Ligand binder design. Structure first.
Ligand code: 6Q3
Length: 154
């Protein structure tokens, strides 16, 4: 009972790009760029498409960094999130009515204004580690339990 999602982090040596969502899933939080994978579309193509739709950036090389499954108690569908990273992009981030992008210095990541699970796996992401994770939520703010392991292959 899982649904595929992508999440792209534009991570450069001294900064990361995040987008403040204006409405829908994750509204009011800084997030990476992503969404549902379409019929007949590979996970990687879905990740490239979402990055452009949401941030206006064109990604050249994408690297698979993680897989995280999210469960919301009472919600049947698990989110199977395939996490990607890039340092090679083209264009300038575009602010739209749906998304407000901003660059953050690595020591200034806004964890208090991000999904709570991010505080757990972003430190791995920053140290170029790959991971498999699972987070059980009750509502949007509480993590009931989780698992998070470093892996050699995503
Ligand atoms: C609970 C949760 C879900 C999520 O979903 C990202 C899917 C791509 O839009 N991303 C995070 N960081 N946390």
């Amino acid at each position: 009972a899982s649904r595929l999602y992508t999440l792209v982090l534009v991570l450069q040596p001294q900064r990361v790009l995040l987008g403040m969502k204006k409405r829908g899933f994750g509204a009011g939080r800084w997030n990476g760029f992503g969404g549902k994978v379409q019929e007949g579309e590979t996970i990687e193509d879905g990740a490239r498409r979402e990055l452009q739709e949401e941030s206006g950036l064109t990604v050249d090389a994408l690297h698979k960094v993680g897989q995280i499954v999210f469960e919301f108690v009472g919600e049947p569908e698990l989110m199977d999130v395939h996490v990607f990273c890039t340092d090679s992009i083209q264009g300038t981030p575009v602010e739209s009515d749906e998304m407000r992008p901003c660059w953050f210095q690595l020591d200034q990541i806004p964890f208090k204004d991000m999904w709570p699970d991010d505080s757990y796996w972003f430190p791995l992401l920053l140290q170029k580690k790959k991971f498999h994770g699972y987070f059980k939520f009750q509502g949007q703010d509480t993590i009931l339990d989780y698992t998070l392991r470093e892996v050699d292959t995503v």
